[PDB]
Design a binder for this molecule. Structure first.
Ligand SMILES: CC(=O)O[C@H]1C(=O)[C@@]2(C)[C@H]([C@H](OC(=O)c3ccccc3)[C@]3(O)C[C@H](OC(=O)[C@H](O)[C@@H](NC(=O)c4ccccc4)c4ccccc4)C(C)=C1C3(C)C)[C@]1(OC(C)=O)CO[C@@H]1C[C@@H]2O
Ligand SMILES: Nc1nc2c(ncn2[C@@H]2O[C@H](COP(=O)(O)OP(=O)(O)OP(=O)(O)O)[C@@H](O)[C@H]2O)c(=O)[nH]1
Ligand SMILES: Nc1nc2c(ncn2[C@@H]2O[C@H](COP(=O)(O)OP(=O)(O)OP(=O)(O)O)[C@@H](O)[C@H]2O)c(=O)[nH]1
Ligand SMILES: Nc1ncnc2c1ncn2[C@@H]1O[C@H](COP(=O)(O)OP(=O)(O)NP(=O)(O)O)[C@@H](O)[C@H]1O
Ligand SMILES: Nc1nc2c(ncn2[C@@H]2O[C@H](COP(=O)(O)OP(=O)(O)O)[C@@H](O)[C@H]2O)c(=O)[nH]1
Ligand SMILES: [Mg+2]
Ligand SMILES: [Mg+2]
Ligand SMILES: [Mg+2]
Lengths: 386, 440, 432, 451
């Protein structure tokens, strides 16, 4: 399965209105076209994705993309895959002012909610409706931020100490002491969310009134327990849902950064450049052997140059079904930066997922052998040979 | 008056400035301490020429210059050397480390906190002027300071002053020899500065001057001192029309008018003909025809480019010495008779000439021989694109793998800022390959 | 001003330090009592890099001495230069690490690290504009590895902008002095690969081979090895202290040498070495310096550069010489040996020239190479590590001090990742 | 600064202590009465080394030692001998009968009423020390006191102190010759406390030292004094790194870290290479390579066991005198090429090196030649198990018929605290067999698959 890719355009901001600008991006169906303000009517480019989203014009319903539309398009399928048993992940991307946060968080106070609370709503409704005497669910949450190559917990109370990152030899990288908390209702997780979003570190720039200074990841552990005490086993399925709100690419001459802000921007840019290299290299690695010869050339991908890539190594490649949501600025001023985002979005589409559903090996083998033996015994008994 | 302000940035600029100011002081009769005994022995004249020296009440002559660098180890040699009493004490070191061959450090993080002092000193220097004509900026590509800080300074100068001419004397990277691994990034990132804010950029190459020293001057093991002396001679030959009398004088605006057909092609080459040792100064007439033919030799160019592969768009010749216009008009004809030198179709004239009476001086301990006729040529041609193209290839080989990029990103620069610059450079190349296409 | 703080840890680092301050004192001109009795005027111009001033015109070295055994402190004090260092900087304890990495890193060093950091803060606060740190230690022991990596982590946490260097004496292939070298080496490299900007790989076997085959000594001792290491140490930093034609701060070397963050392991070299009796036959000039400098038997890391590819190399010359000759020689050594240089870096030699040579020499040169062959060394340790971790050979000494097997496993995994990273560029082809 | 208490129990321990303290006094220039005129002649120095001696106001030095026994006959020789004024009067003798080659009497019928006083004196000695390294217990298997009282004392010390190191130097029964009939019972009953509580135990044999004295020093009729002198030289070479300056120093804990792989196999053998008479001290170079080679010769071992029948798990070399690390590296390299010496595959390095500058001293009236270089080697190997097996056979031949058992049970011992010890010993004999086996071929199943 390929890494799914969604693209969305936001409307103009006051910064793009005080300094006059024009709309450069168009789209039809799943295809998006980029025009060149600097050399117009020379080489308009086009790129094909899984989803394109025109949220420029709210008053008109002509191919308008609401939050519920994007959610029903990708988050519903991700939650369905999670209910099947997969571990799933959809992470944002874009430049400072692309609306990556407006897409993954949205505004709780309005009906235009992001793709994090609507999943939570759908998950809680599904488990509440599907709960029975022989069906139960256990849901736990965690939320961590990466400020400058240090992991901080938002759910925990004030704990100044930074958290250490370890590598379980079988399970891969993880964080130690990440405050994982169980939830039983919508209101509980919502209060946890309010605390987490309030704890996140933000700062004001010339490009955005309230910008983010840290990457942020929301992890939900979902446990399906089928309780037929006579026949079945409990804790049947375990799944991981993770949504990522990356920090925006900083430009310096067009943000006004200075002092501490400049250092934060430099760290953010280093992390994003490492992520981009990982994306391109991974896409090359999965594209080549699949069609070249199948030789499995041992060019290995390197996630150790940043804690972001290290933590998200499973989601980038391996046992996870993953998708991207690139936010774009329509103004001509950002034409270069926007174009880069589009290119990276294209590099995300070629990446392949290697995801499986697995359980305890003894249970799986015993059940399969029992099914095979039952079929063979039924065939033998039906013919009088047993 | 006719006055210029010199700005030297980085180690290369500072050392070239040392050589240049040694030459000017020897030319005008100013002692290293600033006093001029010629005034008290003569009692007249204008040997305190205002083009480079400002006179105080006591009789001292302070030069119009601003030295800049981001480390103390180079400029301190000036502060404790032979010329310590000539310059003003304000020499504008940053009391920190250097840019470490990094454009981002020299343009965004460390390049600031000294730009304001430099601008204040330049403003003070220009306030004393009464007819300032232009600026002379000396720097070197491939260095963090000479690229980044020069870019910042050029932006600020263009904003502040605007109309004054801004010439450039720069050291382009060589095709083969090099002294840093990340030269192409620093050289490509500064195309915007030399292309947008500069008015006429002259370039030289270390390999070409090494070959000239090896062949013409018979120096087997040259060092940077000889290179600096040669560049100083060329700058003096350019500027001499402002200071001394002559039969035909050429101002800086005339150079810009005749060497720059369109705004974006202000990248001429420079050559200096009678480079010859004292032993070989005999056995040769060194007449006008010999020296003016020497300029067109491919082997005597100061950048490793072959003029035969392109077309000559403009040419400016500056003679210093016992030259009479008759001999000049006759050579311009012979070189127009020769077929190996190609001129574009839309420039039927081609040549500008200027003559000055003051012959070149000799630096004690130098390697050039005393001579009575010299000529400096500045030629706008299409061959320079060759020297660009090679560099672009090198850039690609390092940018495909994002080598040495995290150093630049960690200091405040964005990744896309690389690629954008490259496109600009390509566009520049494209325009020097469509001003020659014969007209139809 | 560009001021360096020096730290020494363990017996090996302490003794190497001693001989470094006997090579940096003579070059500037400092008496053992701390007074100045030099001749040239350029010796005091940049003395503040490595020396603080004291009221009687005296100069104290800006250093810090660390151990967990008083014996090495007593040996240094009872010596020719024991009285030059500040008494308050002699930080030490008792009941040393016992060749155990856990004791140095977790149990014993965790008490002394606070005092050492207090001294470091006091020393760094007095500086005008701090350049970076440098630390000398051996990876085969307990005190060195443990407290060195702990101090590196703490200092990098507190001073993130500054450049950090290390000079590591690392386990030899055949020569062995202790039995639990692989565990300590692996656990120390796991931290070194993360919390440093440059690392220089020293190996005892290479130094012994140089002393035998090049210097023709009959009975080498540790003093000669310290002599060579000190010469390289001074040559690396010569450009901060004396003027020249081309200059190279430590940061410039770091920028030009490190293409990607996890590749900062270097092979050092020095020239000329002549053996005290063959100098009358050997001429001295730039080509012969380059010839000895690029030779495989000169390198101090016991790794053959011909088994891989030079990522990037750097040469710092000291003396009065022409630039054309230097550039021509570097171009020639590039072109003749093009098989051993990576193809996607068009020019991978950094050059620097300083005017003042050492006292008794007319010319000298130092070499910092970065090549893939270093991976070989790590493989050796890795193999040995497996041979003792498959059966828990000496594990209970470590786990008894508050450690677990997961740390060993992830430490091995990180080194294997580093080896795979270095290998990726080693093989030919690759190209565009 | 780095103190070590020495505890001597039994006749063998007391006599080895006499030899050891004679050597130490000769080494540090302390007269038998405790005074040190060399310091007065020098005018000041650190010769009053705190590793073994404690200084008082008047300049007298008292050793850090604790002698214990139940027979007054042995301690009374010291109390009226040459060193009567050196030791503190507290010599801790039990003015009663002796254990009489009976483990039970030494342990918990006569070992009581004297253990408390011994522990009090050891507490005072340890309180005087400003930083301890460990203990050095000298005893002998076979004897009643040296088994039972040693077991009780180690039990109490392990309870009280716990973390501090505890070393042994013990006389194991010889394969053929013996001076008692009920030795195997005592040795087997001692092995449990030797195993659980001690941290590193060295063993020596009288027969091997007799053979060494005969072949090397050309003494046809040796006595216990020569053997005690050799053991004293071994212990001095062990502890030399704490006292004198050296290029590479090895602390007592470094031995444990580098020499014992697992907690239950801490039974190494010891050897001393340049044992040679004064007459034969000439005609020979005695270089570093020669002594290093001699350390591995099976004939020079101090326990009657062949290293060729097992495998070397680890080794530790301590050099003393004019040695330069280069020759040591060359010696180790040539040893690593021989095929007779075998090393377990899971210890590729298998060597520890330590160099000290002080050369060994010569005791007046001794039989060892004055030399300029010496080496002491400690090898942790699997051959030693063979020796144990021999002794084990003897035990069975006496326990089938319950011979000499009523003496043991008559002093408050259950019959089944015998067989129990045997089983423990058997378990130990299993482990030394298990560790020495090479790793099974491709221990992690089989490899080789897609990449
Ligand atoms: C007659 C003559 O030419 O004397 C030379 C000499 O013969 C040679 C052999 C010297 C000599 O070096 C050695 O023999 C040596 C032995 C072991 C380890 C290192 C060196 C010399 O000792 C070393 C000494 O070096 C210096 O004087 C430098 O200043 C040197 N100084 C020290 O290292 C030093 C050591 C202790 C106390 C004070 C200073 C230095 C080198 C690099 C950076 C800083 C300082 C020199 C030129 C020589 C002798 C005296 C024979 C050489 O040493 C170096 C590294 O320069 C060996 O390689 C050079 C080549 C020289 O020709
Ligand atoms: N012609 C000539 N070129 C020089 C001279 N000195 C340095 N260069 C050139 O300068 C380049 C190196 O960059 P530099 O200008 O020295 O760097 P910088 O100005 O000191 O700035 P930093 O790197 O931050 O120190 C080399 O490629 C040299 O060719 C000189 O004296 N004469
Ligand atoms: N090497 C050596 N061994 C000795 C020496 N003295 C006694 N032994 C050994 O010790 C054994 C006897 O045990 P001891 O501990 O001396 O007996 P004890 O100390 O008198 O205690 P009891 O058994 O109660 O009498 C003998 O078999 C000897 O082999 C000695 O001086 N040197
Ligand atoms: N499509 C949209 N519709 C309505 N409001 C939007 C939209 N996009 C952005 N905004 C508002 O404008 C601001 C910019 O969006 P935001 O999501 O903060 O950018 P970002 O991609 O997160 N980059 P950063 O500011 O660095 O976090 C937000 O505060 C939103 O409230
Ligand atoms: N070059 C050099 N190496 C040494 C010296 N002394 C010891 N070593 C090396 O250091 C290693 C032992 O490390 P050690 O000093 O005990 O580390 P520590 O115990 O933590 O202080 C051995 O492998 C030796 O090769 C010396 O004087 N010079
Ligand atoms: Mg955001
Ligand atoms: Mg510089
Ligand atoms: Mg007795």
């Amino acid at each position: 399965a390929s890494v799914k890719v969604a693209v969305r355009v936001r409307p103009f901001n006051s910064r793009e209105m005080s300094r006059d600008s024009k709309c450069i991006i168009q789209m039809s169906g799943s295809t998006t076209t980029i025009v060149n303000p600097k050399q117009p009517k020379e080489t308009p480019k086009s790129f094909s994705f899984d989803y394109s989203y025109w949220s420029h014009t709210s008053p008109e319903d002509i191919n308008y993309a609401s939050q519920k539309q994007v959610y029903r398009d990708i988050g519903e399928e991700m939650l369905q895959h999670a209910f099947e048993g997969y571990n799933v992940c959809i992470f944002a991307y874009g430049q400072t002012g692309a609306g990556k946060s407006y897409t993954m968080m949205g505004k709780q106070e309005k009906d235009q909610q992001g793709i994090i609370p609507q999943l939570c709503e759908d998950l809680f409704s599904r488990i509440n409706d599907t709960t029975n005497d022989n069906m139960s669910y256990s849901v736990e949450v965690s939320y961590m931020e990466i400020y400058c190559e240090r992991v901080r917990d938002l759910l925990n109370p004030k704990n100044k100490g930074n958290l250490r990152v370890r590598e379980h030899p079988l399970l891969g990288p993880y964080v130690e002491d990440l405050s994982k908390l169980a939830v039983t209702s919508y209101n509980d997780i919502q209060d946890l969310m309010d605390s987490g979003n309030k704890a996140r570190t933000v700062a004001a720039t010339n490009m955005n009134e309230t910008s983010s200074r840290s990457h942020a990841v929301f992890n939900i552990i979902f446990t399906q327990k089928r309780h037929d005490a006579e026949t079945n086993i409990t804790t049947e399925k375990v799944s991981k849902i993770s949504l990522v709100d990356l920090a925006g690419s900083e430009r310096a001459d067009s943000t006004g950064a200075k002092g501490t802000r400049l250092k934060e921007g430099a760290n953010i840019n280093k992390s994003l450049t490492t992520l981009g290299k990982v994306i391109s290299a991974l896409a090359e690695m999965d594209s080549g052997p699949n069609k070249n010869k199948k030789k499995k050339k041992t060019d290995f991908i390197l996630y150790r140059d940043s804690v972001l890539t290290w933590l998200l190594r499973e989601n980038l490649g391996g046992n996870s079904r993953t998708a991207m949501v690139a936010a774009l600025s329509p103004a001509d001023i950002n034409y270069d930066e926007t174009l880069s985002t589009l290119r990276y979005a294209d590099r995300a589409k070629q990446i392949r997922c290697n995801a499986v559903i697995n359980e305890d090996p003894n249970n799986k083998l015993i059940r399969e052998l029992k099914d095979e033996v039952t079929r063979l015994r039924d065939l033998l008994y039906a013919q009088g040979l047993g | 008056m006719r006055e210029c302000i010199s700005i030297h940035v980085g180690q290369a600029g500072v050392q070239i400035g040392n050589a240049c100011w040694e030459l000017y002081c020897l030319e005008h009769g100013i002692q290293p301490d600033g006093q001029m005994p010629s005034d008290k022995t003569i009692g007249g004249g204008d040997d305190s020429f205002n083009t480079f020296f400002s006179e105080t009440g006591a009789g001292k002559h302070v030069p119009r210059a601003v030295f800049v660098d981001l480390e103390p180890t180079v400029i301190d040699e000036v502060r404790t050397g032979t010329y310590r009493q000539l310059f003003h004490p304000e020499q504008l070191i940053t009391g920190k480390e250097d840019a470490a061959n990094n454009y981002a450090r020299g343009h965004y993080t460390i390049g600031k906190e000294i730009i304001d002092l430099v601008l204040d000193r330049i403003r003070k220097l220009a306030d004393q002027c009464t007819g300032l004509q232009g600026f002379l900026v000396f720097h070197s590509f491939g260095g963090g300071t000479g690229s980044g800080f020069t870019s910042l300074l050029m932006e600020r100068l263009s904003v502040d002053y605007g109309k004054k001419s801004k010439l450039e004397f720069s050291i382009y990277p060589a095709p083969q020899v090099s002294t840093a691994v990340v030269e192409p990034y620093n050289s490509i990132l500064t195309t915007h500065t030399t292309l947008e804010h500069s008015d006429c950029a002259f370039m030289v190459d270390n390999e070409a001057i090494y070959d000239i020293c090896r062949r013409n001057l018979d120096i087997e093991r040259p060092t940077y001192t000889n290179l600096n002396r040669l560049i100083s001679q060329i700058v003096s030959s350019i500027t001499a029309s402002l200071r001394f009398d002559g039969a035909l004088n050429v101002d800086l605006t005339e150079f810009q008018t005749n060497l720059v057909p369109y705004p974006r092609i202000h990248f001429p080459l420079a050559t200096y003909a009678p480079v010859i040792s004292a032993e070989k100064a005999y056995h040769e007439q060194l007449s006008v025809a010999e020296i003016t033919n020497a300029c067109f030799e491919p082997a005597n160019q100061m950048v490793k480019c072959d003029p035969r592969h392109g077309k000559y768009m403009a040419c400016c010749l500056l003679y210093r010495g016992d030259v009479v216009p008759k001999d000049v008009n006759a050579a311009i004809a012979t070189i127009k008779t020769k077929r190996s030198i190609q001129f574009v179709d839309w420039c039927p004239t081609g040549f500008k000439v200027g003559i000055n009476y003051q012959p070149p001086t000799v630096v004690p301990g130098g390697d050039l021989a005393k001579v009575q006729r010299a000529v400096c040529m500045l030629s706008n041609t299409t061959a320079i694109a060759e020297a660009w193209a090679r560099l672009d290839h090198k850039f690609d080989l390092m940018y495909a793998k994002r080598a040495f990029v995290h150093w630049y990103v960690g200091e405040g620069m964005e990744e896309g800022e690389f690629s954008e610059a490259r496109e600009d450079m390509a566009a520049l190349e494209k325009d020097y390959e469509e001003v020659g296409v014969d007209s139809v | 001003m560009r001021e360096i703080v020096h730290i020494q840890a363990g017996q090996c680092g302490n003794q190497i330090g001693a001989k470094f301050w006997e090579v940096i004192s003579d070059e500037h001109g400092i008496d053992p009592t701390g007074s100045y009795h030099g001749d040239s005027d350029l010796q005091l111009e940049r003395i503040n890099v490595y020396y603080n001033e004291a009221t009687g015109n005296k100069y104290v070295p800006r250093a810090i001495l660390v151990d967990l055994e008083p014996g090495t402190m007593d040996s240094v004090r009872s010596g020719p230069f024991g009285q030059i260092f500040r008494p308050d900087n002699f930080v030490f304890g008792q009941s040393g690490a016992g060749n155990n990495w856990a004791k140095g890193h977790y149990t014993e060093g965790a008490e002394l690290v606070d005092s050492v950091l207090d001294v470091v803060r006091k020393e760094s606060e007095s500086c005008d504009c701090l350049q970076g740190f440098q630390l000398t230690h051996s990876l085969g022991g307990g005190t060195g590895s443990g407290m060195g990596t702990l101090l590196i982590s703490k200092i990098r946490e507190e001073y993130p902008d500054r450049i950090m260097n290390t000079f590591s004496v690392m386990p030899s292939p055949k020569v062995s002095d202790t039995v639990v070298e692989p565990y300590n080496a692996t656990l120390s490299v796991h931290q070194l690969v993360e919390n440093t900007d440059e690392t220089y790989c020293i190996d005892n076997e290479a130094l012994y081979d140089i002393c035998f085959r090049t210097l023709k000594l009959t009975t080498p001792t540790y003093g000669d090895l310290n002599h060579l290491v000190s010469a390289t140490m001074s040559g690396v930093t010569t450009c901060l202290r004396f003027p020249g034609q081309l200059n190279a701060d430590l940061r410039k070397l770091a920028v030009n040498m490190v293409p990607f963050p996890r590749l900062h392991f270097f092979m050092p070299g020095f020239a000329p070495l002549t053996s005290r009796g063959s100098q009358q036959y050997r001429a001295l000039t730039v080509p012969e310096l380059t010839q000895q400098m690029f030779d495989s038997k000169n390198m101090m890391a016991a790794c053959d550069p011909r088994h891989g590819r030079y990522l990037t190399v750097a040469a710092i010359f000291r003396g009065r010489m022409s630039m054309k000759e230097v550039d021509e020689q570097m171009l020639n050594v590039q072109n003749k040996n093009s098989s051993y240089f990576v193809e996607w870096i068009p020019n991978n030699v950094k050059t620097a020239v300083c005017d003042i040579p050492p006292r008794g020499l007319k010319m000298s040169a130092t070499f910092i190479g970065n090549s893939t062959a270093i991976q070989e060394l790590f493989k050796r340790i890795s193999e040995q590590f497996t041979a003792m971790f498959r059966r828990k050979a000496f594990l209970h000494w470590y786990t008894g001090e508050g450690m677990d097997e997961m740390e060993f496993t992830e430490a091995e995994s990180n080194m294997n990742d580093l080896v795979s990273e270095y290998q990726q560029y080693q093989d030919a082809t690759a190209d565009e």
